[PDB]
Amino acid sequence: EMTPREIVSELDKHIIGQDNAKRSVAIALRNRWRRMQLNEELRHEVTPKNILMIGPTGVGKTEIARRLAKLANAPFIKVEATKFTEGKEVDSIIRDLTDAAVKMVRVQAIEKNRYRAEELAEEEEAAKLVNPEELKQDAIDAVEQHGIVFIDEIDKICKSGPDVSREGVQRDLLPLVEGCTVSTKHGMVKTDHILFIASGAFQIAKPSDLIPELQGRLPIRVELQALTTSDFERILTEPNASITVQYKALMATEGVNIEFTDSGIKRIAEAAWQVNESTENIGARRLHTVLERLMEEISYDASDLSGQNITIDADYVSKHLDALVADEDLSRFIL
Amino acid sequence: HSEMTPREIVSELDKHIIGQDNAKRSVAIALRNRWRRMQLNEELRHEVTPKNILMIGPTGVGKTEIARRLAKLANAPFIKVEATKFTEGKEVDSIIRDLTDAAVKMVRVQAIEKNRYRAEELAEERILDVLIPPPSAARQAFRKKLREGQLDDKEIEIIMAPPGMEEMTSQLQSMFQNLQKQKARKLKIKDAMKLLIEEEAAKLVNPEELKQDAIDAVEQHGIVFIDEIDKICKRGPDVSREGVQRDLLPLVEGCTVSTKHGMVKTDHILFIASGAFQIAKPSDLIPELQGRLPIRVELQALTTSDFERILTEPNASITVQYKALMATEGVNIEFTDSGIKRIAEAAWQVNESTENIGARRLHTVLERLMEEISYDASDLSGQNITIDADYVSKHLDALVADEDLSRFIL
Amino acid sequence: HSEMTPREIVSELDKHIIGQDNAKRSVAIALRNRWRRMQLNEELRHEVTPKNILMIGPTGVGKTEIARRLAKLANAPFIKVEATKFTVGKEVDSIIRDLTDAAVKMVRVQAIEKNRYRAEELAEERILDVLIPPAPSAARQAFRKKLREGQMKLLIEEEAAKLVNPEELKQDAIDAVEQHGIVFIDEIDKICKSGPDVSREGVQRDLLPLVEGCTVSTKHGMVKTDHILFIASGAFQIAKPSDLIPELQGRLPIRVELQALTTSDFERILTEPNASITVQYKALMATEGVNIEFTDSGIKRIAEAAWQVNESTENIGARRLHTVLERLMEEISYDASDLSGQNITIDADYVSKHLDALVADEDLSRFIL
Amino acid sequence: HHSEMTPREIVSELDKHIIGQDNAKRSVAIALRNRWRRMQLNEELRHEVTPKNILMIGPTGVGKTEIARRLAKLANAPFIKVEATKFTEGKEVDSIIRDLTDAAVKMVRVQAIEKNRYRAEELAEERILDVLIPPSAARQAFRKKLREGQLDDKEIEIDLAAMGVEIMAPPGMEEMTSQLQSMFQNLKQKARKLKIKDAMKLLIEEEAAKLVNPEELKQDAIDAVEQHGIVFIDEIDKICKSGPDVSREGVQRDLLPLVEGCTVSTKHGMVKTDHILFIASGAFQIAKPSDLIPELQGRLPIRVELQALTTSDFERILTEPNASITVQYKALMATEGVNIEFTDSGIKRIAEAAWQVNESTENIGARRLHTVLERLMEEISYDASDLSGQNITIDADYVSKHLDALVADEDLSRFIL
Ligand SMILES: Nc1ncnc2c1ncn2[C@@H]1O[C@H](COP(=O)(O)OP(=O)(O)O)[C@@H](O)[C@H]1O
Ligand SMILES: Nc1ncnc2c1ncn2[C@@H]1O[C@H](COP(=O)(O)OP(=O)(O)O)[C@@H](O)[C@H]1O
Ligand SMILES: Nc1ncnc2c1ncn2[C@@H]1O[C@H](COP(=O)(O)OP(=O)(O)O)[C@@H](O)[C@H]1O
Ligand SMILES: Nc1ncnc2c1ncn2[C@@H]1O[C@H](COP(=O)(O)OP(=O)(O)O)[C@@H](O)[C@H]1O
Ligand SMILES: [Mg+2]
């Protein structure tokens, strides 16, 4: 129901940059509300516009999908395309998607049953109010209408020996996007109106190497740009509940105030940018390992530093990091 | 969740694990974040994920014991899995299935001990009903003779499936038993007392809450240890190796795994990975996995001085266990500082001579040294056997010298 | 469970296994530690793990027989599995499954015999209350002796159902598997150390949780392998125990080498062990009324015959004695019905008559012997 | 139940079916005799005595399986033949005991029904009499008149027991879904009209199942497998010894717990393979018995070579055995009304015809007598209807007329014979 611009503005609270991808996911989610307002004939002719994301690793392709489903209160699942090369069935994507929706409509029922069921409990009582038959069938309606599936590294299943087994995964994934019926333990699930989002680096292959039946089911295409040092500075502070905000609140539990200077944040980003260039580029995930290495001394002594204010400046960053980033052989192990 | 501080955690691990201070500090930080997360608001509890740990070091330096004692300290479910088990196949989700089952038996033993005394009283109470049909005097008489006396010897009348369906057929048999013991049958008080304890304890315990608490134990306090994760890194085989990491990814990133005991969410589960990393390197792991293992720590190889500490310092060390085992036979064993030093030098030499197996060499060396006393322990009763440096060099130096014999016997 | 000393175990094993004293002392220490752990406190019972044994020696020297007699001595569940069986593949957890199933039949038959005589005693006891209703003396004894000797089935069924409970059995069997379980893994040396090495070491990786302790699901319930005793054997001529994975070496603390059998040992195997193969043949012919006696010179030439065939072609161990005897006695075993009431003497000449012709031809020895 | 027949009595009985191979007959007679010898020992010696397994050596089609088949039929013993190569690919080796126990339960069920058939008829015809005269001297007269007479064509309504649910399952669950259906039938009778001719037979089935005890019928079948069971393993020489050698020897390693004695679980209970007699066979031209694993050689103490059949043995197999092929064909044509007669010279050329085809192309043993006979009797077996009332004499000339044209051409012999 949210407007396309309101979705992108909401995604800006988590993902930094990558505006092209945010506009793409907004179009797919907005058509969900647009289809609901149509007549009976057009609701079945209109199919969701699936997205094929393109960009290097660690630029936020998965976070955009996770925040998108969490925004729309939709079931979500991430599956690796290479898992089906070896074995596990391809239909299992809808199975785990169904089991996640059961838990989601169950937790929401537990919050409501913290009242009338509790009143008769302090006076099982929820089972006489929340019905497994009503709950389980409502979960099926959540998958058919609001289902969202993310297929990672779909570029690795493109094309003589392995190419037959790689493209076979595309052939088995084909009925899922084109729409079919998958049997689950919770009931019959239809994948016609489920949204699919595919991602891949596409450095070895190209989206044209996909089977033609699959290209027609991925109408929305978007390239995601690689993150820069200026983007890393933004990720540390701007996003809601960013890694520095989490660590600032985790240390406050011990009674320690943590403050990051503008010069320290800049050099933290310079360290993560250097490690990705020195050894291997893991994307924005390098900020995790670098921060934990930088803060391991403070996190251990936090119990004794209660009631103090520790200032993380540019000098404190270069003291605990410049020694390690300089040695590339050690950077692969520690960072 | 416990409220222990990192320094207090490490000081408790020092009672078990010798050395390896950095590794103790890494696991202490992860466990302290369990309580720090419980003190945040509702928005930050879901955003904060457990900081997993990737241990690096040679085999037999204590990587697993640090995890085992950590789970035992935090009263948490624990499971060790080999990374190479999923290369061949078994599903990766089995890690959460086997961890859940381990949490079920854990919360049961913890609930029986609290409710053991009441269950024992009710068990013997139903036995008195048969001895004296209805405390007056006779009931008090048979009650005291049952606990003190060995009169329990008295007689008193109180789906074929392929290998994959071994789990489901055991669940179907439990449903037919729910829809035997009630029938009056003849038993012995020794075998009927143990059978009446099971009946009374099962009535007192609640399967609804005990099963719900086990799910809370796996979701909130779950700890998973993945051994030899370095053997699945990229190098034909590189596609199958990296395929296991891709299947392990939804576990660290958080997903939903279904189990016989209910629905389990692996979001807040703590993971600890270890490996040698001589052939490969942690960078060889996929990028989505390196981000899920933010805490890294190298463990140092043990030294001869460390082996001396391992033999005695840890609570219930092997020298302490053997000292207590022969005491059952009535033999006092004593290890002198000069003997403990030569036991440690004997293990260090075998590892340098043939293959370095870590601290596990102390296990095979000790049993070889004490195989004579342990066989004759029933005859050494009432004696005080002292293990000095001479006794060690008499039974080991002949063996450690022959490297060909060193690989078979030690 | 049994309270026997290590020397009492070895002395009992001497009634079956000949020689191999080092291996007998090793298995005795393992079985004695079971009783030693039971006397410890609650903390040490979980910290103390059974000391597994890795036997080393050529084939046919008695590595398996020592394990079979040990479990039979301690009234313990036992199973023999080949290490190469798990090289799609069969799950390793089936070892504990087949061990549990074998323990159910083991404890069931032992429970049936206890009830077979106790239920029949109580079945006829209720019959006596209808004949001589008391308010046992001589009146009950008069009818009790006339009912057994003189010319019930529905009363045994009602009495046997009370003495044995199916629910009580399956739970008693689990205590026998978790506490007293004994597993024998044959030819473990063949799974030592690129592709064949990957499948070989994978068996060790899958076997690792069993010795380290874990939980395996069976149809009879949940079984924990922490306190199960494991005994591994192998020739170790191709590889060495150091070639095993390091996690496994630490789980096999007791090591023992077994010596190769000699001609003098073969002579002992024919007679010394209780119910030896010659004693069995003496009793099997005894069913027909035929006396069988083996001379000291005949037993020696029987052992020399088995030693020669193992030296000429391939050494199968002491099992060659079973094939040589049957070839020697095939004529007597066939004519035993007609020779009833006669006594044929098995001397060194009778052995050399039916064997020296066959043992001389190596081409025929591989087929016939 | 352990037959008290002497080894000579066993070989004497086997001669009625198998021709020659006296060495193999004495081997199997020794094995079956030990079954009774062990039953007569003390309790200690009954567990220590193990059955003396046999390994037969010889070319194909010499009677190895027949000697095994007739031996089990003589001892009233469960029997099964399995191909060793079946486990190279796969199926579990425990399935040998599974399929052996299944055939023994069916064996004890057919025998127990034939022995207790009089008791089940009693309740079936008595249930019918509750409908004719519902509750005397008049009730007895109805029972006597029905057995002698044919009053079963009259319409009578009797109450009889009357799920219809199918559970779809993948190919691996064909075994368990058949057992779940047996629990729903276990956890009411419906009244329907019938005919006494068709209701008596439908009542005997219900009465037969209710009268017999399931536990005694299921336990005696186990004792029949454990004590009196027999297993035959064919072409065991193909699992001998680097690529396939690991899988071939792996079959023997899986077969090892069967001969050494173990415990295999089945849907009918728990079976112990300790006292089960095993018989292995094989040509042993490629490999030799010494190539087996050492543990298996010791478990196969009795060894016997079977001699190859000759032209003189073929003439004996055509006539001597009971219900031989020529005897079966004389009786098959006897249905159409044709008296077939085989002359001595005709039988001799039939053996010489089969001997040449084996000598010319491939030697398939005594099985060549079947394809040659049917080729020789194809025109008569086709015209057997219209030849009713005639006496066809098969002489040496008639044999050469229909065979010498085919046997001469070797390219045609591989396809037609
Ligand atoms: N644009 C971004 N803004 C904020 N965080 C980001 C961004 N891109 C990546 N991240 C970080 O990377 C992680 C998610 O990476 P992911 O999207 O899985 O990589 P990829 O896009 O290569 O699949 C998150 O923890 C997130 O903090
Ligand atoms: N630092 C240590 N202190 C005490 N015991 C140790 C130490 N390191 C190893 N051990 C011994 O090693 C055994 C377990 O080794 P483990 O930790 O599994 O090896 P790894 O660390 O390679 O996984 C335990 O029995 C323990 O007694
Ligand atoms: N020391 C021994 N005493 C008596 N019999 C023995 C001895 N060693 C081997 N045997 C015979 O060998 C057979 C068991 O061999 P086994 O132990 O399976 O071989 P391995 O030890 O190579 O596994 C038994 O039939 C037994 O009669
Ligand atoms: N000695 C014999 N006496 C009677 N019939 C025989 C003899 N040898 C073979 N046959 C016949 O030939 C066929 C042999 O097949 P079979 O014995 O099962 O093959 P194999 O022994 O090679 O496994 C049987 O149908 C049997 O009727
Ligand atoms: Mg040696």
The number of angstroms, rounded, from the C-alpha of C132 to the middle of its chain's C-alpha atoms is 49
Strands B186-188 and B383-387: unpaired
Beta bridge partners of C292: C344
Which residues of chain C make contact with D302, given a CB cutoff of 8 A?
A: 326, 330
Which residues of chain C make contact with D260, given a CB cutoff of 8 A?
A: 80
Does residue C302 sit in helix, strand or coil? helix
Does residue C70 sit in helix, strand or coil? helix
If one residue of D17, D62, D82, D237 were mutated to test the ligand 4 pocket, choosing by the most ligand atoms within 8 A of its CB, it would be: D62
Report the alpha-carbon distance of residue C29 to residue C44 in Å, rounded.
18
CB contact under 8 A, D176 and B165: yes
The string of DSSP codes covering D26-66 is HHHHHHHHHHHHHHTS-HHHHHH-----EEEE--SSSSHHH
Answer positive or negative: Cα dihedral of A80, A82, A87, A93: positive
CB contact under 8 A, B160 and D173: no
Pocket flag, ligand 1, residue A264 (CB < 6 Å):
no
CATH architecture of the domain A228-335 equals Orthogonal Bundle (1.10)
Atom of ligand 4 nearest to the CA of D66: 17
Residue whose pair of structure tokens reads 């205590």 in the numeric block = C175
Does residue D262 sit in helix, strand or coil? coil
Report the alpha-carbon distance of residue C203 to residue C93 in Å, rounded.
11
CB contact under 8 A, D267 and B160: yes
Q: Determine the distance in angstroms separating the CA of D273 from the nearest CA of chain C, rounded to an integer.
A: 12
Report the alpha-carbon distance of residue B197 to residue C171 in Å, rounded.
13
Report the alpha-carbon distance of residue D378 to residue D372 in Å, rounded.
10
Number of residues in chain C: 369
Report the alpha-carbon distance of residue A78 to residue A83 in Å, rounded.
11
Q: Which ligand is nearest to the CA of D318?
A: 4
Report the alpha-carbon distance of residue C61 to residue D294 in Å, rounded.
11
Strands C221-224 and C215-218: antiparallel
Q: What are phi and psi of C215, to 5 degrees?
A: -125, 125
DSSP state of B277: -
Pocket flag, ligand 1, residue A284 (CB < 6 Å):
yes
- Return the closest-CA partner of residue D57 out of D337, D303, D294, D232: D303
Q: CA torsion angle for D364, D370, D375, D377 (degrees, to 10)? A: 160
CB contact under 8 A, B316 and C97: no
- Return the closest-CA partner of residue C15 out of D51, B379, D44, D34: D44
The number of angstroms, rounded, from the C-alpha of D157 to the middle of its chain's C-alpha atoms is 41
The number of angstroms, rounded, from the C-alpha of A219 to the middle of its chain's C-alpha atoms is 21
Report the alpha-carbon distance of residue D340 to residue D327 in Å, rounded.
9
Taking only Cα atoms into account, the Rg of chain B, rounded to an integer number of angstroms, comes to: 27
Answer positive or negative: Cα dihedral of D209, D210, D215, D217: negative
Fold category of D310-417 in CATH: Helicase, Ruva Protein; domain 3 (1.10.8)
Report the alpha-carbon distance of residue B328 to residue B382 in Å, rounded.
11
Which residues of chain C make contact with B379, given a CB cutoff of 8 A?
A: 7
- If you measure from the C-alpha of residue B104 to the centroid of ligand 2, how many angstroms do you get, rounded to a whole number? 27
D118 is written with which tokens? 């009089």
Taking only Cα atoms into account, the Rg of chain A, rounded to an integer number of angstroms, comes to: 23
Residue whose pair of structure tokens reads 């790689």 in the numeric block = A166
Pocket flag, ligand 2, residue B311 (CB < 6 Å):
no
Resolution (A): 3.7
Q: What are phi and psi of B194, to 5 degrees?
A: -65, -30
Task: Kindly state the helix (H) or strand (E) to which residue D224 belongs, with its residue range.
Answer: helix D214-226
Contact by Cβ (8 Å): C84, C185: no
Taking only Cα atoms into account, the Rg of chain D, rounded to an integer number of angstroms, comes to: 27
Which residues of chain C make contact with B180, given a CB cutoff of 8 A?
A: 165-167
DSSP state of C59: T
Residue type at position D336: E
Residue whose pair of structure tokens reads 């005291």 in the numeric block = B144
The CATH number of the domain covering residues in C262-369: 1.10.8.60
Ramachandran bin of B48, using left for φ above 0, alpha for ψ from -120 to 50, beta for the remaining angles: beta
Report the alpha-carbon distance of residue B170 to residue B159 in Å, rounded.
9
Residues in contact with D68: Cβ distance below 8 Å, sequence separation at least 6, in sequence order? D28, D79, D81, D230, D232, D279, D281
Residue D23 CB-half CA count within 13 A = 15
> CA separation (Å) from B349 to B309, B342, B345, D95?
17, 10, 6, 51
Scanning every residue of chain B, which has its alpha carbon at the shortest distance from the alpha carbon of A335? Answer: B296
Residues in contact with C175: Cβ distance below 8 Å, sequence separation at least 6, in sequence order? none
Residue C102 is nearest to which of D49, D250, D263, comparing CB atoms? D263
Contact by Cβ (8 Å): C204, C40: no
C247 has binding-site annotation: yes
C186 is written with which tokens? 């044959």
In the PDB record, what is the listed experimental method?
X-ray
Pocket flag, ligand 2, residue B57 (CB < 6 Å):
no
Strands B295-298 and B270-275: unpaired
Contact by Cβ (8 Å): B256, B265: yes
> CA separation (Å) from A74 to A105, A141, A156?
10, 11, 27
Number of residues in chain B: 410
Scanning every residue of chain D, which has its alpha carbon at the shortest distance from the alpha carbon of B162? Answer: D172
Report the alpha-carbon distance of residue D259 to residue D300 in Å, rounded.
9
Report the alpha-carbon distance of residue A154 to residue A201 in Å, rounded.
9
Contact by Cβ (8 Å): D268, D226: no
Report the alpha-carbon distance of residue C290 to residue D7 in Å, rounded.
15
> CA separation (Å) from D136 to B4, B86, C39, D133, D416?
92, 78, 76, 10, 72
The string of DSSP codes covering C21-48 is HHHHHHHHHHHHHHHHHHTS-HHHHHH-
Contact by Cβ (8 Å): A269, A229: yes
Contact by Cβ (8 Å): B385, B333: yes
Contact by Cβ (8 Å): A258, A251: yes
Contact by Cβ (8 Å): B193, C239: no
From the number of C-beta atoms within 10 Å of its C-beta (0-12, 13-18, 19+), residue D109 rates as: middle
The number of angstroms, rounded, from the C-alpha of D11 to the middle of its chain's C-alpha atoms is 19
Strands B53-56 and B78-82: unpaired
Task: Kindly state the helix (H) or strand (E) to which residue B97 belongs, with its residue range.
Answer: helix B94-114
The string of DSSP codes covering C244-270 is S-HHHHTT--EEEE-PPP-HHHHHHHH
Residue C6 is nearest to which of B98, B177, B375, comparing CB atoms? B375
Report the alpha-carbon distance of residue A173 to residue A91 in Å, rounded.
8
CB contact under 8 A, C44 and B316: yes
Fold category of B305-410 in CATH: Helicase, Ruva Protein; domain 3 (1.10.8)
C253 is written with which tokens? 């603390």
Report the alpha-carbon distance of residue C55 to residue D60 in Å, rounded.
43
Which residues of chain B make contact with C29, given a CB cutoff of 8 A?
A: 371, 374-375
Q: Determine the distance in angstroms separating the CA of B237 from the nearest CA of chain D, rounded to an integer.
A: 20
Order the strands of the A76-80 sheet from edge to edge: A76-80, A148-152, A195-200, A51-54, A220-223
The number of angstroms, rounded, from the C-alpha of A272 to the middle of its chain's C-alpha atoms is 21
CB contact under 8 A, C84 and D249: yes
CB contact under 8 A, C28 and B366: no
Contact by Cβ (8 Å): A56, A283: yes
C-contacting chains (≥3 CB pairs under 8 Å): B, D
Number of residues in chain D: 417
Report the alpha-carbon distance of residue D167 to residue B349 in Å, rounded.
65
Report the alpha-carbon distance of residue C4 to residue C70 in Å, rounded.
12
Which residues of chain C make contact with D29, given a CB cutoff of 8 A?
A: 334
How many C-beta neighbours within 10 Å does residue C45 have? 12
Interface test with C, best of D6, D11, D36, D300 (most C CBs within 10 A): D6
C323 has binding-site annotation: no
Convert C198-224 to b/e letters by CB count within 10 Å (16 or more is b).
Answer: eebbbbbbbbbbbbbebbbbbbbeebb
Residues in contact with D229: Cβ distance below 8 Å, sequence separation at least 6, in sequence order? D77, D78, D100, D104, D275, D276, D277
Report the alpha-carbon distance of residue B330 to residue B380 in Å, rounded.
7
Contact by Cβ (8 Å): D280, D300: yes
Report the alpha-carbon distance of residue B240 to residue B242 in Å, rounded.
6
If one residue of A63, A237, A238 were mutated to test the ligand 1 pocket, choosing by the most ligand atoms within 8 A of its CB, it would be: A63
Does residue B261 sit in helix, strand or coil? coil
Residues in contact with D213: Cβ distance below 8 Å, sequence separation at least 6, in sequence order? none
Q: Binding site: what residues of D are annotated?
A: 19, 61-66, 234, 295, 367
A323 is written with which tokens? 């020694």
Q: What are phi and psi of C367, to 5 degrees?
A: -85, -50
Report the alpha-carbon distance of residue B228 to residue C204 in Å, rounded.
14
Pocket flag, ligand 3, residue C319 (CB < 6 Å):
yes
The string of DSSP codes covering B161-220 is --GGGTTHHHHHHHHHHH--TTS--EEEHHHHHHHHHHHHHHHHS-HHHHHHHHHHHHHH
Contact by Cβ (8 Å): C318, C61: yes
Contact by Cβ (8 Å): C361, C330: no
